Design a protein around this ligand. Sequence first.
Ligand SMILES: O=C(Nc1ccnc(Cl)c1)Nc1ccnc(C#Cc2cccc(C(=O)O)c2)c1
Length: 614
Amino acid sequence: KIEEGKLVIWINGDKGYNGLAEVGKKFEKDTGIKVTVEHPDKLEEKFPQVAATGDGPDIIFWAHDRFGGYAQSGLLAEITPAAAFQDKLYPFTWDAVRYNGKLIAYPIAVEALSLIYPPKTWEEIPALDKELKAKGKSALMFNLQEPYFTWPLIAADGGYAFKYAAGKYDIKDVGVDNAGAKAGLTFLVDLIKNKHMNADTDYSIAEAAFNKGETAMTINGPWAWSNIDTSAVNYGVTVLPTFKGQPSKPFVGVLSAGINAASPNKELAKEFLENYLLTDEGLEAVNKDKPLGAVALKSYEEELAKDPRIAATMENAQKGEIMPNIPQMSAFWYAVRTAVINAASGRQTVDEALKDAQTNAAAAHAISERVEKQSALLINGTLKHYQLQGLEWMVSLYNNNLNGILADEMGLGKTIQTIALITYLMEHKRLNGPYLIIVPLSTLSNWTYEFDKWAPSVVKISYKGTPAMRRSLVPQLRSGKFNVLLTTYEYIIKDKHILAKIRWKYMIVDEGHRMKNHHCKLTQVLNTHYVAPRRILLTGTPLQNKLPELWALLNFLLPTIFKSCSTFEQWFNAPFAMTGERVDLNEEETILIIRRLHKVLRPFLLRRLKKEVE
Ligand SMILES: O=C(Nc1ccnc(Cl)c1)Nc1ccnc(C#Cc2cccc(C(=O)O)c2)c1
């Protein structure tokens, strides 16, 4: 479990773990509290597993970005340092450990990419290579294949990953396509076509070139310094050049110390971190085992700044931007990796490659999660290839906080595909919470039966019967002992005073073949009185070319957005109602509205036909 009156700390093997242990020994010496320092293999991967249990370490040491995921799950505690302690650390480092307006960790170290040799501007480098190539060398050689290294000039003029709003990042405000991003990336390909730089240059080539004295400059980080020290090159470290009178913005990696929320030793971790480790002597002890580069502590940074290399990694960091703590970043990197490659290799123009990457980073199904096999709780049958493909798309809906439509033709096992989602959300996620399933009366008994065949594990209630029979089910609900609740549309409408009181995790409505008039009265109640974030619709029809049906589908998928607006006429006339004119849509206007809604809903519907399956 998680032992009281003691401290267990996890830090990576590539860090000053033995140095940190001495700070722990000094803590035990003065207080009596034992401090255990461990470096487990893939600790960033083991931490979310053990912390969800209520086990693992009291303190975790990792970069602030991975801490964003843990903070969302609620695995890390809201740290409570006084104003006076916060004033000791650089204010920007606290922003790296802020999640939903809460300090979730104590910043330790700081890392950013640096210019290693100087050219004050990027613009002055084409000239410099002319000289160096006459002498038999090259002015610059860095890893181009990876977007982490190429990004600082792209971000310089105006480029950005996600726009940082008041407190949070916007995963829809992506700046891979603006004037700035294009200006920077055009300059990069300019240098490639002028033969100053080669597009085939990777990490191994860029490194071996600077070490063998073949190139005058390179862009890397502190991790390289060790391998260049052993190369006897008279290298220096400075700030990255200014593009268009604006500085280059590299990504800032802040080593942080996070407190586990399952730990009974929270005040002990505050005392050890604030008073033993986040001190000049405390950081110095770690820095002696394995250097920390720049540090968040003003006092110890001013002293380390005597070394120009450390004052450099700190100049770059203050001028750059901190790495976003959100999982959407994986889609942004996979976008800009291929964007930069294609542009430079000539396979796409700058304006083309960036257009795609901007579309791909802002895509709804940003977070990817492979589904190889089905859930263990799903037995007495094996899910077909398209049915597994359907489970992967439905988990992607849950992962990216999207509502969706499974419009597969009747008899494609939508029922089994739904059942398979619930089982995977229990096996691989801790989502056992109440599931609402609204089915047609005709197939109610087939749903209760299919659950019995495929997932006997899943304890379900069947909200059906005479008034007295339903009143009998009331206590089992209040317990929350159940996993699923199956019912017809009439009991959602009639027995709202009992069913609306539950905090439904996921909610599923199966309309069968076609939707009916009573499906809208059902959603009118569902929207007003019921609480369910995630929603899924099971239909047999494809996306209709009728505005009333699309209006309905919209109110089912986005219940919040259509509060004040009752009709599609009021909704789509809104940009034209400034004069108080009341005119309905016409044939043409309506065709274009249908067209746009089909484009808008495209990533929320999954349909397969029988002729393309088998
Ligand atoms: O729309 C659907 N299926 C579907 C299937 C294939 N293509 C299309 Cl376009 C649609 N199903 C469907 C299932 C359940 N509840 C609704 C609804 C509604 C609603 C809520 C509030 C106000 C109004 C209103 O009418 O003011 C309507 C729609």
